UniProtKB/Swiss-Prot annotation:
Similarity annotation: Belongs to the GTP-binding SRP family. FtsY subfamily.
Tree of life domain: Bacteria
Record carries keyword Zinc-finger: no
Known function: Involved in targeting and insertion of nascent membrane proteins into the cytoplasmic membrane. Acts as a receptor for the complex formed by the signal recognition particle (SRP) and the ribosome-nascent chain (RNC). Interaction with SRP-RNC leads to the transfer of the RNC complex to the Sec translocase for insertion into the membrane, the hydrolysis of GTP by both Ffh and FtsY, and the dissociation of the SRP-FtsY complex into the individual components.
Posttranslational modification: Proteolytically cleaved. The cleavage may regulate function and subcellular location of FtsY. Full-length FtsY is found primarily associated with the membrane, while cleaved protein is predominantly present in the cytoplasm.
Activity regulation summary: Conformation of the Ffh-FtsY complex and regulation of its GTPase activity are modulated by the 4.5S RNA. Formation of the FfH-FtsY complex leads to a mutual stimulation of both GTPases.
UniProt organism field: Escherichia coli (strain K12)
Residues of the full protein shown: 196 to 495 of 497
The protein's name: Signal recognition particle receptor FtsY
Amino acid sequence: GFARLKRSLLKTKENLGSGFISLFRGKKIDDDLFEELEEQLLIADVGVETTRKIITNLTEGASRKQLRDAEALYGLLKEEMGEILAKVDEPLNVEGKAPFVILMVGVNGVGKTTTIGKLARQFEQQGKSVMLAAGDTFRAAAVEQLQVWGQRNNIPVIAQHTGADSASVIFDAIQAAKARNIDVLIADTAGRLQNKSHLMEELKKIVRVMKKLDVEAPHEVMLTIDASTGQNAVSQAKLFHEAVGLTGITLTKLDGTAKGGVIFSVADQFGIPIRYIGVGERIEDLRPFKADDFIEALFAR
Ligand SMILES: Nc1nc2c(ncn2[C@@H]2O[C@H](COP(=O)(O)OP(=O)(O)CP(=O)(O)O)[C@@H](O)[C@H]2O)c(=O)[nH]1
Ligand SMILES: [Mg+2]
Ligand SMILES: [Mg+2]
Ligand SMILES: [Mg+2]
């Protein structure tokens, strides 16, 4: 089963899930074993804090159960790591708002633009009207691409001149979305990390201005991060989380990367729902995140 997802996690499975079998085979449970396991989790980009938690709970569970063979740790690890992802297994529900405003945050180069386009198409397939806001106002090329895409796919794009105030662009977009009975408004934002302080104050301004029109907006603050960037995805998540209230995460480029274990670090460190995972370039390759599917593909024997 899960043949499709297993293939997309092939490189990650070398170090996590089924990758543990060869590590445990024929060994006993002792300090050396747990030190080996810790190393492999760290190599898999699981993170120091989340790895220590896994080792601590795994050590205690094996001791009180009086386990002897390392192979017996496999089931406890699947449950421990499965729980981490189950805590952030909540699909995004955009129903019942006029419009549902998704504030897309993240740095450049992690797949934010692609995710906007794929989400827009998916919502249209679900019977919804979609509108986009080009809030990345100082990157003329980024604004131009989004406008070209909207005209390709017959989706309205709200944009202003290069250098316009991003909060004002998104304000006008909410007004236009409400006036045109739009179901979902997807607002792009800047992704330049030169000067953390400024970008973060820019996002807080965008949120403040939104609530002039709708105290519920933004209904979703979605971070996009790139699984192939390893711990950079975690530092980026911490940055945007502390600055603005993240409510969802999309993790792209799980396919073809050996660093897919970062998802456990992102899940455990922040507890923010992971809404989608990217496992390909097709529109449908942006899949809703299902913790059970992911664990089963990872730990399948
Ligand atoms: N293998 C893979 N590629 C993906 C995935 N999601 C997006 N991509 C691809 O990664 C590349 C970057 O996507 P993009 O949306 O442009 O990121 P960006 O931050 O907007 C780039 P810029 O800063 O110039 O605007 C693209 O080629 C995109 O098709 C994914 O889930 N898996
Ligand atoms: Mg050792
Ligand atoms: Mg080891
Ligand atoms: Mg872009």
